[PDB]
Amino acid sequence: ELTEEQKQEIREAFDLFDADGTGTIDVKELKVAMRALGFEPKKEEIKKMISEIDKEGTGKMNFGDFLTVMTQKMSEKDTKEEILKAFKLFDDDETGKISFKNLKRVAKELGENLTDEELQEMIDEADRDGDGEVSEQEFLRIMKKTSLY
């Protein structure tokens, strides 16, 4: 699962930044390159990625390396969306946080039989900022670090 019109889009995107056809683009056009592709990367993520990508500080990247990073980023974006889609199914009162109330309702609808003590344990374990409920970032973080997706 990669595809063809999508492999060919990535190529187009790559060539925008390689008008002279030297076969590389400057690692610095990454963010603009990702945006042309529909992504919305953030500073930290770009800092992090330019650093994974240009491990030998050439300042340059080829098409295979670009293709990788973009396939990888498309898979992550799909995962995020799916995690976000589940976020919304726990937060059915749409308060934008997942509560103890939401979580208990979800366990029941799915036929679990946890105690409030276990239910609370699952909040605390997810609640990093200590506001007593679970944000999207917390929920993303919590999926990021479990069994498989």
Add this chain to the structure above:
Amino acid sequence: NWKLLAKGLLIRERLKR
């Protein structure tokens, strides 16, 4: 855990509609 419950809700929803 979080993931079973999330996965549960996702299946429950990809099935209904």
